[PDB]
Design a protein around this motif. Sequence first.
Motif, PDB file in Angstrom:
ATOM      1  N   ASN A 154       0.866  -1.178   0.000  1.00 48.93           N
ATOM      2  CA  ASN A 154       0.000   0.000   0.000  1.00 48.93           C
ATOM      3  C   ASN A 154       0.900   1.224   0.000  1.00 48.93           C
ATOM      4  O   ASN A 154       1.073   1.892   1.025  1.00 48.93           O
ATOM      5  N   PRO A 155       1.498   1.549  -1.148  1.00 44.34           N
ATOM      6  CA  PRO A 155       2.505   2.620  -1.173  1.00 44.34           C
ATOM      7  C   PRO A 155       1.945   3.999  -0.890  1.00 44.34           C
ATOM      8  O   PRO A 155       2.723   4.913  -0.589  1.00 44.34           O
ATOM      9  N   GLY A 156       0.633   4.186  -0.977  1.00 46.54           N
ATOM     10  CA  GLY A 156       0.051   5.495  -0.777  1.00 46.54           C
ATOM     11  C   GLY A 156      -0.249   6.176  -2.094  1.00 46.54           C
ATOM     12  O   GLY A 156      -0.615   5.515  -3.070  1.00 46.54           O
ATOM     13  N   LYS A 157      -0.096   7.497  -2.139  1.00 42.13           N
ATOM     14  CA  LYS A 157      -0.285   8.258  -3.363  1.00 42.13           C
ATOM     15  C   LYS A 157       1.031   8.609  -4.037  1.00 42.13           C
ATOM     16  O   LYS A 157       1.050   9.449  -4.941  1.00 42.13           O
ATOM     17  N   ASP A 158       2.133   7.982  -3.619  1.00 40.57           N
ATOM     18  CA  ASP A 158       3.431   8.210  -4.232  1.00 40.57           C
ATOM     19  C   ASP A 158       3.901   7.061  -5.107  1.00 40.57           C
ATOM     20  O   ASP A 158       4.825   7.253  -5.904  1.00 40.57           O
ATOM     21  N   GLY A 159       3.300   5.883  -4.980  1.00 43.50           N
ATOM     22  CA  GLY A 159       3.731   4.731  -5.743  1.00 43.50           C
ATOM     23  C   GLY A 159       5.036   4.151  -5.243  1.00 43.50           C
ATOM     24  O   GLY A 159       5.832   4.847  -4.605  1.00 43.50           O
ATOM     25  N   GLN A 160       5.270   2.876  -5.527  1.00 38.65           N
ATOM     26  CA  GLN A 160       6.495   2.198  -5.137  1.00 38.65           C
ATOM     27  C   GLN A 160       7.270   1.809  -6.386  1.00 38.65           C
ATOM     28  O   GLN A 160       6.721   1.166  -7.287  1.00 38.65           O
ATOM     29  N   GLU A 161       8.537   2.207  -6.442  1.00 39.15           N
ATOM     30  CA  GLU A 161       9.374   1.863  -7.581  1.00 39.15           C
ATOM     31  C   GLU A 161       9.631   0.364  -7.616  1.00 39.15           C
ATOM     32  O   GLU A 161       9.916  -0.257  -6.591  1.00 39.15           O
ATOM     33  N   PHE A 162       9.519  -0.217  -8.808  1.00 38.95           N
ATOM     34  CA  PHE A 162       9.751  -1.644  -8.967  1.00 38.95           C
ATOM     35  C   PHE A 162      11.183  -2.000  -8.590  1.00 38.95           C
ATOM     36  O   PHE A 162      12.124  -1.257  -8.882  1.00 38.95           O
ATOM     37  N   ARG A 163      11.344  -3.149  -7.936  1.00 38.64           N
ATOM     38  CA  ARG A 163      12.666  -3.690  -7.664  1.00 38.64           C
ATOM     39  C   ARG A 163      13.102  -4.714  -8.697  1.00 38.64           C
ATOM     40  O   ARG A 163      14.306  -4.948  -8.847  1.00 38.64           O
ATOM     41  N   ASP A 164      12.154  -5.323  -9.405  1.00 38.30           N
ATOM     42  CA  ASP A 164      12.457  -6.251 -10.495  1.00 38.30           C
ATOM     43  C   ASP A 164      11.329  -6.170 -11.507  1.00 38.30           C
ATOM     44  O   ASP A 164      10.456  -7.043 -11.567  1.00 38.30           O
ATOM     45  N   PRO A 165      11.314  -5.120 -12.331  1.00 35.58           N
ATOM     46  CA  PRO A 165      10.183  -4.922 -13.247  1.00 35.58           C
ATOM     47  C   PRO A 165      10.063  -5.998 -14.305  1.00 35.58           C
ATOM     48  O   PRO A 165       8.993  -6.130 -14.910  1.00 35.58           O
ATOM     49  N   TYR A 166      11.126  -6.766 -14.552  1.00 34.51           N
ATOM     50  CA  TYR A 166      11.055  -7.840 -15.535  1.00 34.51           C
ATOM     51  C   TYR A 166      10.022  -8.886 -15.142  1.00 34.51           C
ATOM     52  O   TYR A 166       9.405  -9.506 -16.013  1.00 34.51           O
ATOM     53  N   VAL A 167       9.814  -9.090 -13.844  1.00 34.40           N
ATOM     54  CA  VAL A 167       8.849 -10.059 -13.351  1.00 34.40           C
ATOM     55  C   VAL A 167       7.662  -9.370 -12.683  1.00 34.40           C
ATOM     56  O   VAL A 167       6.949  -9.995 -11.904  1.00 34.40           O
ATOM     57  N   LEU A 168       7.452  -8.083 -12.961  1.00 37.19           N
ATOM     58  CA  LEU A 168       6.314  -7.319 -12.449  1.00 37.19           C
ATOM     59  C   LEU A 168       6.220  -7.346 -10.928  1.00 37.19           C
ATOM     60  O   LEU A 168       5.169  -7.023 -10.370  1.00 37.19           O
ATOM     61  N   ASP A 169       7.292  -7.741 -10.246  1.00 35.13           N
ATOM     62  CA  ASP A 169       7.328  -7.916  -8.796  1.00 35.13           C
ATOM     63  C   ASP A 169       6.315  -8.939  -8.298  1.00 35.13           C
ATOM     64  O   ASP A 169       6.103  -9.051  -7.086  1.00 35.13           O
ATOM     65  N   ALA A 170       5.686  -9.696  -9.198  1.00 34.38           N
ATOM     66  CA  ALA A 170       4.653 -10.652  -8.820  1.00 34.38           C
ATOM     67  C   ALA A 170       4.882 -12.023  -9.440  1.00 34.38           C
ATOM     68  O   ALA A 170       3.922 -12.773  -9.635  1.00 34.38           O
ATOM     69  N   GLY A 171       6.121 -12.368  -9.755  1.00 29.68           N
ATOM     70  CA  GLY A 171       6.389 -13.660 -10.382  1.00 29.68           C
ATOM     71  C   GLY A 171       6.050 -13.762 -11.851  1.00 29.68           C
ATOM     72  O   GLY A 171       6.855 -14.267 -12.637  1.00 29.68           O
ATOM     73  N   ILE A 172       4.866 -13.302 -12.242  1.00 26.98           N
ATOM     74  CA  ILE A 172       4.427 -13.321 -13.636  1.00 26.98           C
ATOM     75  C   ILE A 172       5.396 -12.492 -14.470  1.00 26.98           C
ATOM     76  O   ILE A 172       6.018 -11.561 -13.941  1.00 26.98           O
ATOM     77  N   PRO A 173       5.568 -12.782 -15.756  1.00 27.90           N
ATOM     78  CA  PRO A 173       6.542 -12.041 -16.558  1.00 27.90           C
ATOM     79  C   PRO A 173       5.953 -10.794 -17.193  1.00 27.90           C
ATOM     80  O   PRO A 173       4.786 -10.742 -17.582  1.00 27.90           O
ATOM     81  N   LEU A 174       6.800  -9.768 -17.287  1.00 30.33           N
ATOM     82  CA  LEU A 174       6.372  -8.499 -17.862  1.00 30.33           C
ATOM     83  C   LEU A 174       6.018  -8.639 -19.335  1.00 30.33           C
ATOM     84  O   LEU A 174       5.156  -7.910 -19.837  1.00 30.33           O
ATOM     85  N   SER A 175       6.658  -9.574 -20.038  1.00 27.78           N
ATOM     86  CA  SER A 175       6.416  -9.722 -21.467  1.00 27.78           C
ATOM     87  C   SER A 175       4.954 -10.016 -21.769  1.00 27.78           C
ATOM     88  O   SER A 175       4.446  -9.613 -22.818  1.00 27.78           O
ATOM     89  N   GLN A 176       4.262 -10.706 -20.868  1.00 26.58           N
ATOM     90  CA  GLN A 176       2.860 -11.045 -21.060  1.00 26.58           C
ATOM     91  C   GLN A 176       1.920 -10.072 -20.365  1.00 26.58           C
ATOM     92  O   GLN A 176       0.710 -10.310 -20.344  1.00 26.58           O
ATOM     93  N   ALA A 177       2.445  -8.988 -19.792  1.00 22.45           N
ATOM     94  CA  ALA A 177       1.592  -8.028 -19.102  1.00 22.45           C
ATOM     95  C   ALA A 177       0.586  -7.376 -20.034  1.00 22.45           C
ATOM     96  O   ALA A 177      -0.404  -6.809 -19.560  1.00 22.45           O
ATOM     97  N   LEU A 178       0.811  -7.445 -21.346  1.00 25.95           N
ATOM     98  CA  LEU A 178      -0.094  -6.830 -22.305  1.00 25.95           C
ATOM     99  C   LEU A 178      -1.451  -7.514 -22.361  1.00 25.95           C
ATOM    100  O   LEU A 178      -2.378  -6.955 -22.955  1.00 25.95           O
ATOM    101  N   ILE A 179      -1.591  -8.703 -21.766  1.00 24.87           N
ATOM    102  CA  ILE A 179      -2.894  -9.352 -21.702  1.00 24.87           C
ATOM    103  C   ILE A 179      -3.857  -8.557 -20.835  1.00 24.87           C
ATOM    104  O   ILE A 179      -5.076  -8.659 -21.007  1.00 24.87           O
TER     105      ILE A 179
END
Lengths: 214, 40, 106, 120, 120, 120, 207, 207, 207, 96
Positions: G110-135
Amino acid sequence: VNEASVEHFYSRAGLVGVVEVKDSGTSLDGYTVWPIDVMGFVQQRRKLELSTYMRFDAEFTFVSNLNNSTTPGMLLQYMYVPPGAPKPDSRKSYQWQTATNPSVFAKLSDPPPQVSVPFMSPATAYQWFYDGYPTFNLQYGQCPNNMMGHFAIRTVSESTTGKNIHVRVYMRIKHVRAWVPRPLRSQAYMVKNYPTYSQTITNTATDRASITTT
Amino acid sequence: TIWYQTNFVVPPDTPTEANIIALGAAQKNFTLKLCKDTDE
Amino acid sequence: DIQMTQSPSSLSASLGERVSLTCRASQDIGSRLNWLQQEPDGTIKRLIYATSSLDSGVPKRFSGSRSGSYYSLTISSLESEDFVDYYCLQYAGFPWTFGGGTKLEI
Amino acid sequence: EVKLVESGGGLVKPGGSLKLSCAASGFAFSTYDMSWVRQTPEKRLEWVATISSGGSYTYYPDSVKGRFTISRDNARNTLYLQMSSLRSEDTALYYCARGGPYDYDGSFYTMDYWGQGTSV
Amino acid sequence: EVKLVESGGGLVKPGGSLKLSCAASGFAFSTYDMSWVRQTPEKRLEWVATISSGGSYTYYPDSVKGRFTISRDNARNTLYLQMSSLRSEDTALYYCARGGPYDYDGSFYTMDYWGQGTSV
Amino acid sequence: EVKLVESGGGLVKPGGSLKLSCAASGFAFSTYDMSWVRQTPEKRLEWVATISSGGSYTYYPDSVKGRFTISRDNARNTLYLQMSSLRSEDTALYYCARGGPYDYDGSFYTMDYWGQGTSV
Amino acid sequence: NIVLSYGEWPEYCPSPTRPDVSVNRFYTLSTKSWKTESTGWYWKFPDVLNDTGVFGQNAQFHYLYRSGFCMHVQCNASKFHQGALLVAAIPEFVIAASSPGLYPDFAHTNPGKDGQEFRDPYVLDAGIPLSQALIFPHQWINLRTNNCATIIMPYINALPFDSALNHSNFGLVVIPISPLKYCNGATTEVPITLTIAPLNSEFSGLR
Amino acid sequence: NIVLSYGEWPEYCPSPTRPDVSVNRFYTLSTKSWKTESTGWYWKFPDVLNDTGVFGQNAQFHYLYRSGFCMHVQCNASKFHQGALLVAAIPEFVIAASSPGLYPDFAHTNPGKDGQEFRDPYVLDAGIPLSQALIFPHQWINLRTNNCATIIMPYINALPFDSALNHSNFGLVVIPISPLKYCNGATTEVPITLTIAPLNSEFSGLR
Amino acid sequence: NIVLSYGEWPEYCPSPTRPDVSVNRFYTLSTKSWKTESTGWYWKFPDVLNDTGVFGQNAQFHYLYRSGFCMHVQCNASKFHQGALLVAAIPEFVIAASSPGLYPDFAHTNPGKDGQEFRDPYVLDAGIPLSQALIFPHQWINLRTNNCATIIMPYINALPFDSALNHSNFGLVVIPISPLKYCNGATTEVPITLTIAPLNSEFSGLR
Amino acid sequence: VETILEVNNTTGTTGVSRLLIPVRAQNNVDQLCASFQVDPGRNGPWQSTMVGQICRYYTQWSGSLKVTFMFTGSFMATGKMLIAYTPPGSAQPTTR
């Protein structure tokens, strides 16, 4: 078409858990409780974690036998503790008689018992991903409205029998409807109930020598 | 008040200091009353 | 580290010869191996990037090549201003190790 | 041109601190990921430290891993590198150049242009 | 500014070779047609050689016409000029500047900015 | 960078003339309003003279007010400052920098970048 | 070019406090400097407003809530600037930790109204891969063609009404795929602005 | 975008020599270099033409005169140039001196066809303040949007006909409010061009 | 803006192998770096394709041939680049030598699909002067307005059918009149692309 | 009729440069650029407006005003600004 649909993608009932009624040696239980869990095996988990909300009822089959594949006449009780009923705690326990917990009384030497659990959830559909905290660190993303119940299995006996009974629970997903597709999990599953991954990232695509080589 | 929402981004070879010019007026509902001399 | 090292510690050729300096990597490093030319006392310029492509200003006498695990550099005809040190650098293995040297003589 | 110049080195007793400057111009020193390379007396260039293209990320090899402290002014167009309690066998011509594992559109300028190298 | 600098000269025995560098920056050294001018000891600037704006064409006066060999790096921002078997009365301060009969939009920068001049 | 360099100073008999150059580059020396500041031997920087951004207007403090004559080449990228019949107590390190009361969009670069300072 | 998520405008649940243009205004959050080293940002759906203006009073002082949104991202970039963003809205965006400690910190979920910078954007920080985020519903921000992205998101949840301070429906991620680049002498930090506008909001269970 | 002064096209006084497109041509005066240090310029209404072509023959060799104008200012500026002009036509623009000698020089009240640079543009050289100059007919020249300003001015005077070499009706001022700026390596003097076209001119009292 | 040469689309000779979109495709030859020192290029009409794809099989393995063309030149130039090309199609372009040895080399009269750089573009390498080359079908390529030039050329010859490997009907010349210029820090070689598309081709006399 | 406000009225700033609000590059986000009260007839930036002078020839007035802003930077320069208005009740807001 008609073979890539979501109704067929989740068919073909598979093993969701191998429970064992330990009854001999140093484990004279005589009973065992198996909390109904769909995301028990990674193969089924990764498929179920393709959608966000899903609604389905299940048919459970119990392929039980001894540890040398022989199926004697021993009687067995399959009690379905609903979502919100106290679970049994011993071979001889009051819970084994409660008429609100449906039981199935079949023997080892009989066609595997097959029941049909309905859609048991407070909300409209199951939620594999629940961003948020329940009970308005050990609580993030734990939805309590996904519990389907418990299957308690005991040999109807008085004293210890001395025979371990291995049960293989098979679940079939019927009437499934899925919502909000998600990317398929790429990293490993470091722990159950959480999406936790490991530091060493594994690239989705395999690495070749150069960009211009096939 | 005029707040810096974003930064001031420019491509290369471009001055990095501009000016805002404010112009004031009165809408068609303006009224005046009790004419009097001024204080220069 | 992958420890890509050059085999000729020191070589000597003629002003019309064709030297062939190698850099044998151990692990899979891909096409991410560079060559850095060092003056006798000055800074270290670059020759090859991604093992194949010349830099924006390097002459035509230099050229890179790849062969399995035997990344190498070969000068066309060894003109003047060449009897200096040579290095091979890879940026695949994250420790980013280097090789030895190929100080040419005549 | 990518004109980088290292300065700020010299003798120092074993155990202390001695920074290093790599003030560079002639190129956008706000998008390139620079790094530090050490040329020991044995003429073996070893990686020293690196810095991201915005001075937020840093990979420290096993050479220091807790001793050297890199930085980036990024406004006065300078590059810092600390030598906190340098070891005995730590004398080298600490070169500075471009190249960094960050800056996704990298792997092209990996130590493309170098500095001059100041002794210690 | 059009900053040109000549370097690479000095003494040499009559008969041999001695190149010359005119590395220049501060202006697009890929569109201007440069040339070489010699300032003899008699303080009489004579044309030496020229080069097109892409290093493909060349006019050699009767001074060398077969001996001097000009070139153009055009990527390392340098200008070459060979002195193959220089004659006895060939010592001069070989200046380098812009200006060339090619580059149709010329005749404006005809030796506009000059270098420094290295002796021989 | 705003690279300004002062030069052209030295000793002179009381009563005469001695100009000063502030040739600067690396920035548009056709829109900034420069000025001259003197650092006396008592280490007290006093304003000397100023010049508009086009060499048309000039404010002379009570220090000279009729003796010093500033100018602006604006094409050779230079800044002039005359020392016509300098007084006895007039020796100082005459710095040159930006900043000027003209150039309406000013008051931001008021002596932002400075030169080097030549003695007299 | 407003990507109507799943082809459904947010609507009022047929027949609760139904606010109006007083709350249905345009909340313009702080800008974020997009640099070359930048990895990305993400804002939760109702958590980004739980402390901003009237919506912060209607959310905390209540018990049930449902509303769509009108997330709108703009990048005040020059014409000599290059880069590309991937602006996607992720329903039930669940953040994951990264073990070499097992559960995400509260500041990261719950980063608030400032947002949290990704630590590993390649995996969307959620295990799932960024390449398929377009779904997911998404829109590209390619500085060479356009620098705006508007996403209309309905209310996506299982129950009709739900809590507003505990369950955050989705998360607006903004990830630079092609990093920012520029020659010397340019604004070294392209600003990114985000505008939010609750659409067809409702509330219940006062105080 | 032609600012028709006071909403009145110049017209012929109903029923004198009425010239035609021979005199009603486009007089393009010399350009003026707009620099950063520039303060402004101003040209009187008929004095700017009393020595230019046919209009200089019809004005001097006569006794009465009346005509509108079609002042049209353009600035050939680049796209990396910034600045802003205030192009206003001031009826009965009376210049004032500045005592620390009491009356304006003749060169400052009839500058010719070259204009006189302002010595104190903040006060319009006439005591009145520049901030309120917009009450006159005017048009902005903002280099980021447009670099053209056309003003149509009728004949504004008390008497129907008046002298042409003594009484100059108005004055076209051009004042840079936001000064010109540019990075190194640009044309350091934006040129300003002025085009005049007498509209519905008349004359009387020959020789 | 397609300059239809002599106002005649290429047509089929009324009633031979008549190929189709398999051969009537868009052959995109190699690009040529346009520099400041560049003098020009020229490609013969059917000789530029006699070794390229299907058209190289239909031309060599035959005895008679006739076809128009759709020459189309484009220059991927920036906006800070300046210059001008003269793209003209010269029917019966006959190259001439230059005696201080009397006849043109074969490499200069049939350059292939690479074109031959002019040695004296002022005289079109054919004695005739370049200044009058505009009498031929042509189109200007002026980098400040447009960087494209499309020329539609019919079959211009005396006999209906003719050989394809001996007689080359015309030649597409491309000559820079105003040389290329750019400030430091730009692509020092503007690329020029040429696309060919045989229109209404025919063939006869197989093998 | 719209006229200019001397919004930059400050001790020292002289000449026409009092009519200009400086918008520069290294002014970090959420910072304050300028502020001026809406009072046509009290000594301030409105004192150079045709309304700010006529309203000093009278005793009472009431109506709606308007403040047209104009950017005078390069065409290539981009960015964003927040322009907020505060009713007479409250005071000047402290943060963006």
